[PDB]
From Swiss-Prot, chain B:
Catalyzes the cleavage of citrate into oxaloacetate and acetyl-CoA, the latter serving as common substrate in multiple biochemical reactions in protein, carbohydrate and lipid metabolism. The keyword ATP-binding applies. It comes from Homo sapiens (Human). It is an enzyme of class 2 (transferase). Phosphorylated by PKA and GSK3 in a sequential manner; phosphorylation results in activation of its activity. This is ATP-citrate synthase. The lineage of its organism: Eukaryota, Metazoa, Chordata, Craniata, Vertebrata. InterPro entries: ATP-citrate_synthase, Cit_synth/succinyl-CoA_lig_AS, Citrate-bd, Citrate_synth-like_sm_a-sub, Citrate_synth_N, Citrate_synthase, Citrate_synthase_sf, Citrt_syn/SCS-alpha_CS. There is a cross-link at residues 478, 484, 492 (Glycyl lysine isopeptide (Lys-Gly) (interchain with G-Cter in ubiquitin)). Changing residue 484 to R/Q: Decreased acetylation and increased de novo lipid synthesis. Abolished ubiquitination by the BCR(KLHL25) complex. It catalyses: oxaloacetate + acetyl-CoA + ADP + phosphate = citrate + ATP + CoA. Changing residue 478 to R/Q: Decreased acetylation and increased de novo lipid synthesis. Abolished ubiquitination by the BCR(KLHL25)complex.
Amino acid sequence: WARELGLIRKPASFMTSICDERGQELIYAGMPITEVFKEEMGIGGVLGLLWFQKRLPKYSCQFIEMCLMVTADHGPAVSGAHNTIICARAGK
Amino acid sequence: SAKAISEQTGKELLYKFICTTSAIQNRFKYARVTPDTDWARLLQDHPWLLSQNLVVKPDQLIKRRGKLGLVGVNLTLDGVKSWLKPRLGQEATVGKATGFLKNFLIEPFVPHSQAEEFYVCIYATREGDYVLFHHEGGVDVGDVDAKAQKLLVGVDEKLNPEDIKKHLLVHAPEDKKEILASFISGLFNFYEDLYFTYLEINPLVVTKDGVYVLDLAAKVDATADYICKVKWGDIEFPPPFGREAYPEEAYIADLDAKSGASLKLTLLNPKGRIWTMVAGGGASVVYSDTICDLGGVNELANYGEYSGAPSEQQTYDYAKTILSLMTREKHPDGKILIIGGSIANFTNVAATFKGIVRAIRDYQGPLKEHEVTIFVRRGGPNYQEGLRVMGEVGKTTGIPIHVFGTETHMTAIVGMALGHRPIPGKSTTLFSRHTKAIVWGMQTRAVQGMLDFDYVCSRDEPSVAAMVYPFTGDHKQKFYWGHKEILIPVFKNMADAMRKHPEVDVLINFASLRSAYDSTMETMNYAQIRTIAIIAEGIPEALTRKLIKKADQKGVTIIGPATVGGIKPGCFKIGNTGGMLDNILASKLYRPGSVAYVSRSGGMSNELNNIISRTTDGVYEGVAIGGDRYPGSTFMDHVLRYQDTPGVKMIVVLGEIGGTEEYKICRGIKEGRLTKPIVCWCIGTCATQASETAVAKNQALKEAGVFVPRSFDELGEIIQSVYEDLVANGVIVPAQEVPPPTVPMDYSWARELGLIRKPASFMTSICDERGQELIYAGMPITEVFKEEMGIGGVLGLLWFQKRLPKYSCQFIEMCLMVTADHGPAVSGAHNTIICARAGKDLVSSLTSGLLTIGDRFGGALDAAAKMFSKAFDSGIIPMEFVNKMKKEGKLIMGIGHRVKSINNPDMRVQILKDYVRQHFPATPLLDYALEVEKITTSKKPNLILNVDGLIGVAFVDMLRNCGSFTREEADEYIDIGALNGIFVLGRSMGFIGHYLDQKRLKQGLYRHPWDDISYVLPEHM
Ligand SMILES: CC(=O)SCCNC(=O)CCNC(=O)[C@H](O)C(C)(C)COP(=O)(O)OP(=O)(O)OC[C@H]1O[C@@H](n2cnc3c(N)ncnc32)[C@H](O)[C@@H]1OP(=O)(O)O
Ligand SMILES: O=C([O-])CC(=O)C(=O)O
Ligand SMILES: O=C([O-])CC(=O)C(=O)O
């Protein structure tokens, strides 16, 4: 109630610039989620908006998706997938 | 701070650290006699006492010892013994000072002529060091300026011995020229390199044999001790010679140095009725001056002082020791206590006065008996609550307490204490609206006050451009600009802050008293800086003289050191002057006025702000030059800087005792340069060179042509009088009072006063990090260690919040050590070894191993505990329970081992089972599980209780069988999962051991074999 009337200041920590959950609709960098879907940007587009806060061009977003899909798996004998299979096989 | 040292230590370090080509005799030849020590030990450790003649002087800082006949010359050992029979240990006087004569210093007497003596006196001034030498022996050395040779040697300047032979040895005899020139050069090198302030050697016996010293006076720069811990040794600062110390005074003295707050007290007349319990040093000084001026000079009991925001126990001890001191005797006119002081900067007045009312309500009885009266006047942040609680305790305890704030004069309560009134290229513009500054160090409170002052003055831009801190990286600090969040960039180095902000002309150095010199020298290499305000206090005087010399060479104005800063209302504020915005809006410092003041102590600047706000229009610019005796900017520079400024109409100067600083103002008024009206008043009379006292300075200024008030009571009156006399000439027009912008309150400040509620989440009951010491459940950590409880004790305090008995804590440790590891082939240890072998740290490897612990791996503890608890609580016999588990199609978990079956026990099940049998008081559930394994071993011999089942059933048995558990909490921690915490905390030991083992064996990254996979992928998708 005393911050609604604006007669107090509290030092606000937790500075962030990647999401605006309040208001009407979700804003990633400066653009709403409906403009994200209307401009037909891919998952590389939301990595551009969330990680770099910039609207990357279409070839950059498609390359980010492309370098995500080759990174997707390299078998179970690698060490992290071995850890995943061990932890999943122990009922977790 | 120049402190006089004992001459014994002075000549000890003189003989220790002299550097000359000549030979200096009497090497370690001195002795000390006190009434405590004997004479046989001093004779046996010093066999040289029977060689030559002896001489004795009092070693208690007594000036003119030979004139009053307190020296024993040309006497032998029993001669000086019989000389010290009627003198050692009792009352003696010199000048005005009378006191106990305690210490005596004894030297080998040198038979000397009147022509072999020499006079040397070297000391520090502002523009350099004075060297005074006279060649004619004895006390009769004549004038010190014409016949005796005087030398100005500069700062950071080498003294050539050729100059000593040229100028210091004009009238000196030719036979002792080179030896005395070498001695003078060595004495100057010693004086410079060990950082003294004053040396005087009146007898200097320079014979053909060598040079002897017989008596000397030495004052050292005591603030340079951080340079000279190793070269002073155990330095000694003797007190001035006088009366002894009272036990209350000694109690105040040794509670003074145990904190970062000044708690001083000195008594004048112990039977007086006017008392001093006063914050702020200048406030106590002007209170003593006004009491001695109003006729209470023979009645002023003491001057006391509490500054630097002392703690509640500190002010409680000080108040009980000073309020238990007028209760010894009474007065026919009553007794008066003054809770006085200036305006506090940031100290909460209400908490200090809560300590005051607790200390008074402890001793209200003798105060009512002795008929005392309390006069209270303070101010600052939240003094309304303090005056209200003094009024409440006055109405409650019956003691008449008369309370005022900043609306009255700060000293006028003294005016009704005796009943005298009825009781109701150096630039002339330092700062402007375009002025930016760089703050050196983490002083975010000061920067926030800076930005608040800039916001309330309707200024468009913040005056803090950057912050410099070498101990952190380049980042940004989040501050307030009114309501808005802004970012001030914090830089590691100074060079990038100077490159990125070329508009900065002010640097405010918040460095310590021993890192300010190098930071100021680094600042002055940049030509954009026109002024540096050095806040730190403690800086040695030679480094300050070097700062002054480079400031005169570069034209940079240095405000300080030992200052709070300087305030220009409407343009800029330095550091912590004024305080927070309570005092700024109280003193109307958001708009410029027409009065400019120069003061020395920063504590009187707040009361000068209050006086100028109340009596006259307001402050245009106010600079406190600092309490150091070598100021970077003097009075005279600031007075000409105001005189060159056309904005001011009058200058108020508040000097103090000592220094010829405003005789320059006197002679500049007589020269006609200073035409604007000046109101000046000298604090520090203390009449309880003759031109250094405040009263002679006062009528010196009065017949100089200055409106000097008679006392501090009429200072605001004479300022108001000259204001009303000067507005009649039509030069001062009062501007229209524009209301300032209003900042919102701070959240921590408004929660300190308790006028807000915030819903506090994050409820916890397992640790109390605040306060004095760590509290786990309700007991401190020292009681944890004193009762000798183990790690099971702190699991009892942290997990269950209960002091478990000794067998329960030892059993918790016991069930932790069997759980510690079970090899690497288990699944979690495999995860730990895999993650540790892939180059990860301890946290990631232990974490990736711990995340395997679930229902299949390590889940037998909690599930076996719940299974046997639900079996025992439902009243089912073990024979029916085994059949019920068999015909439900699931195994009894916690029962069944692979290899170790019958007369081959698990050997850690056995130890835990035995400890539960002798040490637990009652075991229903363990006996139930024993009956279940007696059935299942009759089924198959390897179906014994596992360690995972026995720890579970014995842990439930411990919780529901021992004390302090109320039979829902013993069944609650099982449901929450306290069995899982036992397993994970135990197995973390083995997992960290696995990490350390796989990192110590230095094994590279693991990849599984392809022949142990058997891929079953579909043919084509
Ligand atoms: C009546 C009136 O109110 S008027 C006031 C008149 N006088 C004054 O204004 C004096 C009051 N202020 C001061 O004197 C203070 O010194 C201030 C305001 C300059 C601040 O100084 P401080 O806080 O003492 O020093 P600072 O915070 O820099 O730290 C002291 C030392 O700790 C060192 N230090 C800090 N943290 C660590 C650490 N973790 N490990 C090792 N050293 C450390 C700092 O580097 C610094 O070293 P230095 O002395 O070589 O610089
Ligand atoms: O502002 C300052 O430095 C003085 C201060 O906090 C106090 O002790 O009241
Ligand atoms: O705790 C478990 O359930 C697994 C284990 O350590 C074992 O192999 O005995």
